[PDB]
Design a protein around this ligand. Structure first.
Ligand code: HEM
Ligand code: HEM
Ligand code: HEM
Ligand code: HEM
Ligand code: HEM
Ligand code: HEM
Ligand code: HEM
Ligand code: HEM
Ligand code: HEM
Ligand code: HEM
Ligand code: HEM
Lengths: 142, 145, 147, 140, 142, 147, 140, 145, 140, 147, 140
C-alpha cells in the first residue's frame, strides 16, 4: 500500500539521494554494483551497453537513463493517470528483451539499499519505499 | 565566451597533471608520439613532412615532437590571459604560414589529437572545456591556412 | 558556434533542477505541456508527428506523459553537462531514436528551442536566458546531428 | 656533469619553481628583467619583441617561448639523444642573432637568480652543470 | 592489450591509491578482505603469516611485501625488459607453494576494486587496469 | 646509538617517496644502479655475492631488476616507519633471507649506507642527510642483526 | 668585480636572508647540510665539531661561527682595507686545515644554494663576484 | 635527539590514555602487576626483593607497584621538559643507589616492561618512540648501576 | 566520608584538573605557591629542593613528586587496602620532617585553592572528606 | 507535567554516560548498589519483591548483577532520548515486563526516583539535578504506565 | 581571621567570580544547585520559592536575593560595625526558618564549590575564615 503520505516521503528522499549532476552516477553505481553482486547473470542483459564495464561512458549513459526513468516515475507518484501512462511506455521498452521476472524485485532491493545508504539508515521507511517501488515495477514487468 | 576562465582554468590543471618537466622524458615522448599517431590517422598528413619522418625511434622526430607539444603547452598555460595567448598563437601562425602543407584543418586535427589523448591518459578530463579551448588555440595557429 | 562554458552549464543545471526536481508536484506537467503548447503554436505541422501519443488531446494522460517523458530526457542531458563523456553517449542515443522517427528534421529542434525560450522565463526564478541558449544548443545539436 | 641523478634533481626543482598558468608568465618576466639587470646590453637584442614594455603581451609571449623552450629542454634531460637534437635545432636558430658567450653567461646567472626565489630547496651545483649542458648546445 | 598510455594511467592511479606510510595498509586491507570474502580457501595459503588474523603485524608485513611487489611491477610497466626479469623472480617465489591458478584472477579483481574504491569510480578505466594487471600476474603464475 | 625520531622518519619518508614514487619513470633504475655502482666501488669483493643476478653486466635486465628489487625493499621498510610493529616483522624477514646467503656480513650494510649516503644527495631535492643516517641505521640494523 | 654598488646589493640581500635569532641557526645548518650534499668529502673535515649530529649544539655553534664570520665579512665589504685585514686573519686560520680550492668552491655553491631560498630577489652575478672576493682572501 | 619532542609528545598522550586517576584502582593495579610479571620474567630479579614478595594479592606489593608506576608516570609526563626530567631521574637514581640489587640492566628490563605492556593494552602505540624515551628514562634511573 | 560514590567524583575532577605533560608542572608549582601564600612558614621546609627559585628544575621536580604522590593516592581511593598501605608508606617518610597538623591543613587549603581553578565543576564537600582521608594517613 | 527538553536530555545523557561508560571499572556496581540501598531504605517493603535475585545479600553476585542489569536498563533508555520513536518502544517493553511482576506499583517508581536523586549528586561531576528529574520522569512514566 | 588584608582579597575574588548581569543569574543557580547536591535535605527548605523548576523566575529571583545579600555583605567586610548590623538583620530573618549549622555548612561548601570555577586565582584559606565570619553572624 503506497499511501499519499508515502509518496511525499518517497519523492523527497528520492530527490535528496538522486541529486544533481554527477551525484546521480554515485547512486547508479550503488544500485548496479549491488544488483550484479547478488544476481550476476543479470549483467549479460546489458551486453549492448557494455555491462561488463559499468564505469564506461556507454553504460553510465544507460544507468542515468534508467535512474531518469525511475526519477520520472517517483516524481509522478501523486499523478497516477500520468504514472500509468509512463509505466505502460516503460513496459513496452522491456518486454521482448527476456528480462527475468526475478530481476525486478532484485532491482527494487538494490535501489532501496542505495537510497538508504545515501540519505541515512535511521528512521528510513522501508514500508513506504518497498510499497511504492513495487507499484512502479509491477507496471513495467509482465 | 568560447573557452572561458573556468574552461581555461580546468584545462590547465588537467594538462599540467599529465605534462610537466618533473616527469621522465620517455613519458613525455610517449604522449607526444601517441598524439602524432592520432594526428597522422585523422589528418592524413605525410609523416615525411617532419624531421625523422614520423619514426618514433628517430631522435629528430622525438625532438620535433617535443617542440610541437611544448608550443601547445605554452599556449595552454596562457589560456587564462587571452591578451598574452592571442600573441603566442599569432607567433605560431606566422611560423606556419611559411611552412608548406600546413592547413587549418590539419591544425584542428592535431589540436583535437591533444584532447583525445589527454582523455585517454586522464579519463576524468573535462572534454567540453578541452574542446572549446583547443578550438580557440587551433583557430589562431591555422588562421588564414 | 557558441560555447556552453563551465560557468554556463553550472548556472543552467542549478536553475533547471530547482524547478524540475522530483521533490515537487504538479510542476513538471504544467511546464512540459506549455513547452509543447508553444511548440505546436510555432509549427502546427509538428503536431502530426505525435499522433501516436494522442497529440490532439493534450490533457490526456497519454500526451501529458509524453511531455514529461520528453522534457525529463532533457533533464537527464542537462545533469550530464558535468560529464560530457557520458553526455555524448546519451546524445547519440537520442539522435538514433529520432533518426528512426519519420518526419523529424533538424529545423524542428530550432523550433523546440524557441518553445523552451518562451516557457522557462515564466517559470524559472533566476533564469539566465543567455546561458540557456548556448547549453541547450550543445544538447540539441547532439540529438539533431544526423537528421 | 649533469648525470642521471642530477637531471632528476634539476627537473624536480624546475617544476615547482616554474609553476603553471600565469605563474609562468611572472616567472618568465622576472627572468629577463634579471637578465637585463645583470647585463644591460642584452636588452637591445630583444627590440623586435616589445621590450619597450616588459608587461606587454608581445614581450611576455617572447619570455614564455624562451622559458617554454627551457621547459621542454629540461623535460628531455634524461633522454640524451633527444635533447641533443633539440639543442642542435635551437643552436641553428640563435646562430644568426649575434650573441656571445657572455650573453648565455648572463642568462644562466639570471636563471640562478630567479629560480631559487620560488623554492625552499635549491642545489646550485647541479643547476650549474646542467645549465652548462644546455647553453653549450645552444651557443654552439 | 596494455598500451603505453594505459601504463601512464595505471602508474599514476596506482601511486595515488598506494600512497605513503600507513595508507598502503588501507589499500592492502581492502584487497585481502575482498579476496578472502570471495575465495575463502585462499586464507589457508597464508597460514605461515597468520592469515587468520590479517590485522596482525606478521600478516601486515606480508601484505605490504605483496603490495610492494605489485608497486615494483606497476612502476616498471614502461620498462618491459626489467619488468620481465622482475616477474620471473616473482614467479620463482610462488611456484611449489601450490597456489590455485584461479587465485590470480581473483587477486586481480580485488586489487582493481581497491584502487577503484580509493581513487574514485567515475571515469575509472577497467580496460587499462585489467589488461595491465593481467600482464603482471601472467608472468608470475604458471 | 642514534635515534630515528618521529620528526626524523617523517622527513625521510616524504623526501624518499617524492623521488621513488611509482608515478615516475626511468628514476628507479638510475638511482638503484648508482647505489650498487657506489657499493661495488667501495668494496669490490661485494660484487662476487651477486653472480646469480648477473653483476658483471649492470645494464642487463637481470641486474637492473635486482637493484630495483633491493631498493624497493628499502622503500617498503621506509614507509613502515609509521608502523614499527610491522617494521620489526619486515626487518626480521629480510634478516633471515640475508642470513641464508653465504658471504653477507654486517660490515656490508655499513658499506651499503655509504652508497646511499653518496647517491641520495645528488638525486633528492630537500635531502636532510642527517635524518637519513639515523633512520637508515634503524632499518639496516634490523636486517644486519644476526650476520 | 664586487664594486661599491654591488657590495650594497649583496649586503642588503644577506641581511634579510640571514635573519636574526634562531633563523640564523637554521640558516647556518642548511648551509653546511647543502655543503655536504654538494661535496660529501667535506663532512669529514668537521669531525671535531660534532658533525655526527648536525642539530647538536656543538655543530650548530660551528655553523654560526662560520656564518657569523661571513656576517662580519659582508659588513666590511665597503671598507676595503678592513676586510682585507680580516680575510688575512681568517686565511691564516684555515691554512693548516688541509683545504683545497674545491672546498671553497663547494661552499660558495652552498651559499648560492641556501641564501636565495629565503629571498624574493637575488642577483647571483653580484653574489658570484663578491663571494670570490671573500674566498680568495681566505683560501690564500 | 633520542626521544625528541615529537617522541615525548606521543608517548605522553598514549600513556595517559592508558593511565590516569579517573580509572579504577583495580585497572591501575592490573597494568602494574602485569608490568611486573614481564619484568620478573625478563630480568630474573627476585620478587622477594619487594614488599609483599610479588604476591599480586598482597596489598603491600600492590602499593609498592603503585609507587614504581607512579614514578615512571611522573617521568613520562615530564619528557617534554628534559631540564625537569633529568632532575626527576636524578632523584630516582640516588634513591636506587641506596638499594642493594638494583642494576642498570634490571632498570632497562622494567623500563622495557612498560613499553611491551602499553603495546598490549594499546596496540596503536608508537613503539619506536616508546623505545627511545623509555631508554632515556632508564639511563637516568640506572646511571652508575 | 569519602565513600565509593564520592571517590569516583574526586578521581574524576582530579583528572581534568591535574592534566598531562607540562600542565602538571604548572599545576604543581601553583599548589606550592599557594601553599606558601597560605602559610609562609612552610616555605623553609623545602630548603633542600631549590625553593629559592620555584621555576627551577629542582623545585619543580619536588612539586611533581608531591602531586604525583597525590595522583597515585587518588588512583587507589577505591582500593581501600592498597591506599592504606601506600599512606602508611608515605607516613613513615614524613615522620622525621618535623611537620604539624597545620602543615597538612595549609596543604589541603592549597589543594582546595588550585584544583577548582582548572575546572568547571567542583564539589568541595567531597574533596574535603577525601583529602582528610589522605592527610590523616600521611600525618599519622 | 514537566517537559524533558532538548537541552535537558542532552545534559543528562552526557553526564550519565561520563560515569556509566563501559570503559571504567568498579563504578557500575558501587553506583547501582547505592541506588537500591537507598531504595530499600525508603520503602523496606520493596526488598521483598527481589527475593528471586537474592536481595537479602547485596554483595552476592546474584544481586549485584541485578543492580547492574536494572540500572544499565536506564542507561539504554537515557541514550534513547535522542530517538523518542525508539524510546517509546523500549519503555512499553519495560512496562509490560513490570506489569507481569506481582507487587510492582507505580508509587515504587516515585521511590526509585528518590534513590537516583540521592545517589547521582554524590557520584556525578557536573550533575544538574533539575534536568535529571524531568527526564527521569519522562522515562519512569513510560515504564510505570499501566501499573 | 578575615583581617583587613584578607577582606580585600575576598572582596576582589568575589567580584570577578560573581560577575554582572545574567552571569550573576547562572552563578546564583549554580550555587543552590551545588547546595542541593551537597545536602539533599536543603532543597525542601525552598519549597516556597519555585524550587520545582530551578530555571524558573521565582527560584532565580530567590537565588539572586541570596547571592545579592552575599554581595552586600562582602562589600561591607571592611566596615566592621556596618556588616555586624546587617548580619544582625539577616540573622533575625533566618531565625524562624528551622535551619541548623549544617545548613550553613552546606552553603559554605557550595560557595567553595562554585566561586573558584569562575576564577584563575582562589585562596580557600581566606575564604574559609571570611565565610565563617558571615555564617556565624547569620546563623546566630
Ligand atoms: C524501476 C525499474 C526500471 C526502470 C525505471 C527502467 C528504465 C529503463 C530505461 C529508461 C531504459 C532506457 C531504454 C532506452 O532508451 O533504450 C532501460 C533500458 C533497459 N533496461 Fe530497464 N528499467 C528498470 C528495470 C530494469 C531491470 C530490473 C532490468 C534487468 C534485470 C532492466 C533491463 C534493461 C535493459 C536490458 C535495457 C536495454 C539495454 C540496452 O538498451 O542495451 N531494466 N530501462
Ligand atoms: C596545435 C598544433 C600545432 C602546434 C602547437 C605547432 C607548433 C610548432 C612548433 C612550436 C614548431 C617548432 C618551432 C621551432 O622550430 O622553433 C613547429 C614546427 C613544425 N610544424 Fe607545427 N604546430 C602545430 C600544427 C602543425 C600541423 C597541423 C602541421 C602539418 C600539417 C605542422 C607542421 C610543422 C612542421 C613541418 C614543422 C617543422 C618546422 C621546423 O622544423 O623548422 N604543425 N610547430
Ligand atoms: C532537446 C530536445 C528533445 C529531446 C531531449 C527529446 C527527447 C525525446 C524523448 C526522451 C522521447 C521519449 C519517447 C521514447 O523514447 O519512447 C522522445 C520521443 C519523440 N520525439 Fe523527441 N526530443 C526532443 C526534441 C524533439 C523534437 C523537436 C521533435 C519533433 C518536432 C521530437 C519528436 C519526437 C517524437 C515524434 C517522439 C516519439 C513520439 C511517440 O512516443 O509516439 N523530439 N524524444
Ligand atoms: C639559454 C637558453 C635559451 C633558450 C632555451 C632560448 C630559446 C629561444 C626561443 C624558443 C626563441 C623563440 C624563437 C621563435 O619562436 O621564433 C628565442 C628567441 C630569441 N632568443 Fe633565445 N634562447 C636561449 C638563449 C638566449 C640568450 C642567452 C639570448 C640573448 C642574450 C637569446 C636571444 C634571443 C633572441 C634575440 C631571440 C629572437 C627575438 C626576436 O625575435 O626579436 N637567446 N630563444
Ligand atoms: C600481482 C600479484 C602478486 C604479487 C606482486 C605477489 C608478490 C609477493 C611477494 C613480494 C611476496 C613476498 C615473498 C617473501 O618475501 O617471502 C609474496 C608471498 C606470497 N604470496 Fe604472492 N604475490 C601476488 C599474488 C599472489 C596470489 C594471488 C597468491 C594466492 C592466491 C599469493 C600467495 C603468496 C604466498 C602463499 C606467499 C608466501 C607466504 C609466506 O611467505 O608465508 N600471491 N607474494
Ligand atoms: C638496507 C639494506 C638492504 C636491503 C633493504 C636489502 C634487501 C634485499 C632484497 C629486497 C632482496 C630481494 C631478493 C629476493 O628476495 O629474491 C635482497 C637480496 C640480496 N641481498 Fe640484500 N638488502 C640490503 C643490503 C644488502 C647488502 C649490503 C648486501 C651484500 C653486500 C646484500 C646482499 C644480497 C644478496 C646477495 C641478495 C640475493 C642476490 C640474488 O638475488 O641472487 N644486501 N636484498
Ligand atoms: C668561505 C668562507 C669561510 C669562512 C668565513 C670561515 C670561517 C670560519 C670560522 C669563523 C671558524 C671558527 C674557528 C674558531 O672559532 O676556532 C672556522 C673553522 C673551520 N672552518 Fe671555515 N670558513 C670559511 C671556509 C671554510 C671552508 C670552505 C671549509 C671546508 C670545506 C672550512 C673548514 C673549516 C674547519 C675544518 C674549521 C675548524 C673545525 C674544527 O675546529 O674542527 N672553512 N671557519
Ligand atoms: C623504570 C624503572 C623504575 C622506577 C620508575 C622506579 C621507581 C621507584 C619508586 C618511585 C620507588 C618508591 C620510592 C618511595 O618509596 O618513595 C621505588 C622503590 C623500590 N624500587 Fe624502584 N624503580 C624502578 C626500577 C627498579 C628496579 C629495576 C628494581 C630492582 C631490580 C627496583 C627496586 C625497588 C625496590 C626494592 C624498592 C623498595 C624501596 C622501598 O620500599 O623503600 N626498582 N622504585
Ligand atoms: C598531603 C599529601 C602529601 C603527599 C602526597 C606528599 C608526598 C611527598 C613525596 C612523594 C615526597 C618525595 C620524597 C622523595 O622522593 O624522597 C615528599 C617530600 C617532602 N614533603 Fe611531602 N607529601 C604530602 C604532604 C606534605 C606537607 C603538607 C608538607 C609540608 C608542609 C610536606 C613536606 C615535605 C618535605 C619537607 C619533603 C622533603 C623535601 C626535601 O627532600 O628537602 N609534605 N612528599
Ligand atoms: C527507571 C526505573 C526502572 C528501570 C529502568 C527498570 C528496569 C528493569 C530491568 C532492566 C530489569 C531486568 C530483569 C530482567 O528483565 O530479567 C528489571 C527487573 C525487575 N524490576 Fe525493574 N526497573 C525500574 C524500576 C523498578 C522498581 C521501582 C521496581 C520495584 C520497586 C522494580 C522491580 C523489578 C523487579 C521485581 C524485577 C525482577 C527481579 C528479578 O529479576 O528477579 N523495577 N527492571
Ligand atoms: C549564608 C548566607 C545567607 C545569606 C546571605 C542569606 C540571605 C537571604 C536573603 C536575602 C533572603 C531573602 C529574604 C526575603 O527577601 O524575603 C533569604 C531567604 C531564605 N533563606 Fe537565606 N541566606 C543565607 C543562608 C541561608 C541558608 C544556608 C539557608 C538554608 C540551607 C537559607 C534558607 C533560606 C530560606 C528558606 C529563605 C526563605 C525562602 C522562602 O521565602 O520560601 N538561608 N536568605
Amino acid at each position: 500500500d503506497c499511501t499519499s503520505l508515502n509518496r511525499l516521503l518517497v519523492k523527497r528522499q528520492w530527490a535528496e539521494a538522486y541529486g544533481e549532476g554527477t551525484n546521480r552516477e554515485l547512486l547508479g553505481n550503488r544500485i548496479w554494483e549491488d544488483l550484479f553482486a547478488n544476481m550476476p547473470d543479470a549483467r549479460g542483459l546489458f551486453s549492448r551497453v557494455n555491462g561488463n564495464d559499468i564505469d564506461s561512458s556507454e553504460f553510465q549513459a544507460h544507468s542515468l537513463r534508467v535512474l531518469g526513468g525511475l526519477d520520472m516515475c517517483v516524481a509522478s507518484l501523486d499523478d497516477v493517470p500520468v504514472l500509468n501512462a509512463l509505466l505502460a511506455r516503460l513496459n513496452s521498452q522491456h518486454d521482448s528483451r527476456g528480462i527475468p521476472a526475478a530481476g525486478y524485485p532484485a532491482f527494487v532491493a538494490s535501489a532501496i539499499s542505495a537510497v538508504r545508504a545515501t540519505v541515512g539508515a535511521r528512521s528510513f521507511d522501508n514500508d513506504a519505499w518497498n510499497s511504492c517501488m513495487n507499484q512502479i515495477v509491477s507496471g513495467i514487468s509482465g | 565566451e568560447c573557452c572561458s576562465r573556468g574552461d581555461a582554468e580546468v584545462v590547465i590543471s588537467e594538462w599540467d597533471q599529465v605534462f610537466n618537466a618533473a616527469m621522465a622524458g620517455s613519458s613525455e615522448s610517449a604522449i607526444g608520439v601517441a598524439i602524432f599517431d592520432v594526428f597522422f590517422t585523422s589528418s592524413g598528413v605525410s609523416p615525411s613532412m617532419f624531421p625523422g619522418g614520423g619514426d618514433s625511434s628517430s631522435a629528430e622526430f622525438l625532438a620535433q615532437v617535443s617542440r610541437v607539444i611544448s608550443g601547445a603547452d605554452i599556449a595552454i598555460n596562457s589560456l587564462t590571459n587571452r591578451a598574452t595567448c592571442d600573441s603566442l598563437l599569432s607567433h605560431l601562425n606566422a611560423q606556419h604560414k611559411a611552412i608548406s602543407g600546413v592547413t587549418g584543418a590539419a591544425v584542428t586535427h592535431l589540436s583535437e589529437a591533444i584532447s583525445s589523448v589527454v582523455a585517454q591518459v586522464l579519463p576524468s578530463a573535462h572534454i567540453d572545456a578541452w574542446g572549446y579551448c583547443m578550438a580557440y588555440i587551433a583557430a589562431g595557429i591555422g588562421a588564414g591556412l | 558556434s557558441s560555447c556552453c562554458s563551465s560557468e554556463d552549464r553550472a548556472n543552467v543545471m542549478h536553475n533547471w533542477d530547482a524547478a524540475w526536481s522530483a521533490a515537487y508536484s504538479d510542476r513538471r506537467v504544467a511546464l512540459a505541456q506549455a513547452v509543447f503548447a508553444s511548440l505546436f503554436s510555432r509549427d502546427a505541422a509538428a503536431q502530426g508527428l505525435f499522433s501516436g501519443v494522442s497529440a490532439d488531446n493534450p490533457d490526456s494522460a497519454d500526451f501529458r506523459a509524453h511531455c514529461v517523458r520528453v522534457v525529463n530526457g532533457l533533464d537527464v542531458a542537462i545533469n550530464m553537462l558535468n560529464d560530457p563523456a557520458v553526455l555524448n553517449e546519451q546524445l547519440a542515443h537520442l539522435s538514433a531514436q529520432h533518426q528512426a522517427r519519420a518526419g523529424v528534421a533538424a529545423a524542428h529542434f530550432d523550433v523546440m528551442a524557441e518553445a523552451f525560450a518562451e516557457v522557462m522565463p515564466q517559470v524559472s526564478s533566476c533564469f539566465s536566458s543567455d546561458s540557456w541558449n548556448r547549453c541547450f544548443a550543445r544538447i540539441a545539436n547532439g540529438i539533431s546531428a544526423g537528421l | 656533469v649533469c648525470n642521471r641523478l642530477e637531471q632528476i634533481l634539476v627537473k624536480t626543482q624546475w617544476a615547482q619553481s616554474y609553476g603553471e598558468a600565469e605563474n609562468r608568465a611572472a616567472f618568465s618576466r622576472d627572468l629577463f628583467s634579471e637578465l637585463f639587470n645583470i647585463q644591460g646590453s642584452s636588452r637591445a637584442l630583444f627590440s623586435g619583441v616589445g621590450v619597450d614594455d616588459m608587461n606587454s603581451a608581445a614581450f611576455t609571449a617572447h619570455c614564455l617561448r624562451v622559458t617554454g623552450a627551457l621547459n621542454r629542454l629540461i623535460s628531455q634531460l634524461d633522454q640524451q639523444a633527444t635533447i641533443n637534437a633539440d639543442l642542435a635545432h635551437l643552436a641553428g636558430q640563435h646562430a644568426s642573432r649575434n650573441l656571445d658567450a657572455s650573453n648565455f653567461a648572463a642568462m644562466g646567472q639570471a636563471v640562478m637568480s630567479v629560480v631559487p626565489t620560488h623554492l625552499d630547496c635549491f642545489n646550485q651545483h647541479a643547476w650549474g652543470e646542467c645549465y652548462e649542458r644546455i647553453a653549450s648546445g645552444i651557443s654552439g
